[PDB]
Design an enzyme around this catalytic site. Sequence first.
Site, PDB file in Angstrom:
ATOM      1  N   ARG B  54       0.840  -1.054   0.039  1.00 19.91           N
ATOM      2  CA  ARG B  54       0.153  -0.034  -0.191  1.00 19.91           C
ATOM      3  C   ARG B  54       0.717   1.310   0.046  1.00 19.91           C
ATOM      4  NH1 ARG B  54      -3.135   2.604   4.482  1.00 19.91           N
ATOM      5  NH2 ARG B  54      -4.462   4.117   3.209  1.00 19.91           N
ATOM      6  N   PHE B  59       1.623  10.885   0.942  1.00 23.14           N
ATOM      7  CA  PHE B  59       1.129  10.557   2.299  1.00 23.14           C
ATOM      8  C   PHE B  59       1.918   9.321   3.067  1.00 23.14           C
ATOM      9  CE2 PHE B  59      -2.058   7.595   4.743  1.00 23.14           C
ATOM     10  CZ  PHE B  59      -1.810   8.065   6.002  1.00 23.14           C
ATOM     11  N   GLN B  62       3.684   1.884   2.790  1.00 18.92           N
ATOM     12  CA  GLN B  62       3.255   0.923   3.859  1.00 18.92           C
ATOM     13  C   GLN B  62       3.492  -0.526   3.567  1.00 18.92           C
ATOM     14  OE1 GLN B  62      -1.005   0.992   4.946  1.00 18.92           O
ATOM     15  NE2 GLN B  62      -1.039  -1.133   5.658  1.00 18.92           N
ATOM     16  N   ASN B 101      -1.962  -0.262  12.114  1.00 16.76           N
ATOM     17  CA  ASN B 101      -2.493  -1.032  13.006  1.00 16.76           C
ATOM     18  C   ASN B 101      -4.178  -1.025  12.783  1.00 16.76           C
ATOM     19  OD1 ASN B 101      -3.514   1.529  13.837  1.00 16.76           O
ATOM     20  ND2 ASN B 101      -2.698   1.550  15.796  1.00 16.76           N
ATOM     21  N   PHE B 112       4.697   1.793   8.309  1.00 19.74           N
ATOM     22  CA  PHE B 112       4.440   2.682   7.262  1.00 19.74           C
ATOM     23  C   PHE B 112       5.711   3.697   7.247  1.00 19.74           C
ATOM     24  CE2 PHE B 112       2.108   6.436   9.018  1.00 19.74           C
ATOM     25  CZ  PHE B 112       1.737   5.776  10.192  1.00 19.74           C
ATOM     26  N   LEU B 121      -2.656  11.321  12.544  1.00 22.24           N
ATOM     27  CA  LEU B 121      -2.109  10.109  13.154  1.00 22.24           C
ATOM     28  C   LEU B 121      -1.812   9.873  14.540  1.00 22.24           C
ATOM     29  CD1 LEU B 121      -0.903   8.923   9.536  1.00 22.24           C
ATOM     30  CD2 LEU B 121      -3.290   8.380  10.749  1.00 22.24           C
ATOM     31  N   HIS B 125      -1.455   6.182  15.993  1.00 24.26           N
ATOM     32  CA  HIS B 125      -0.513   5.192  15.666  1.00 24.26           C
ATOM     33  C   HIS B 125       0.921   5.658  16.274  1.00 24.26           C
ATOM     34  CE1 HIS B 125      -2.230   3.413  12.161  1.00 24.26           C
ATOM     35  NE2 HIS B 125      -2.914   4.692  12.073  1.00 24.26           N
TER      36      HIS B 125
END
Lengths: 6, 164
Positions: B54, B59, B62, B101, B112, B121, B125
């Site tokens: 991903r 951004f 991941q 997660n 990521f 985040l 995270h």
Amino acid sequence: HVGPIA
Amino acid sequence: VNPTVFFDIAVDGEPLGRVSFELFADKVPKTAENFRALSTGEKGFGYKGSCFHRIIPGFMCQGGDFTRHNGTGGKSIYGEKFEDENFILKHTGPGILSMANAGPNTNGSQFFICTAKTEWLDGKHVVFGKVKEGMNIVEAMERFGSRNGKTSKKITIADCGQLE
């Protein structure tokens, strides 16, 4: 489902 | 001293470069160790060979799931999952290494690499590292991402390990 979002 | 690990990125065979990171010691003594022992491939499993399923341009990138290669597998060095270490560190800017997660207490092997400031985040995270060098290799893995996060090619962790 794992993962950060925008 | 605070560990330093790295990944040797590839793009469908054709090697790209290296990205190293500074795991955190005093901040995350159990979360960094997780990523360390995996970056190494210290138990017959770890990020060796796994990929970046991903990638979202602007951004983050991941990866971490060496099991199902999609966003469901992966696993920590304590079986499969482990509590939210702490939320002392925040997603301040590009290069920030952070745990991926599915809500609280769901830390596997997935992570990521942020490629911008991802402030929303924070708290959600666990931040436990930062790119040391090779943030250029990271910014090159982006030309292979998308809106949904689908890899336009095949970005692989051709290798990884601990230098310090």
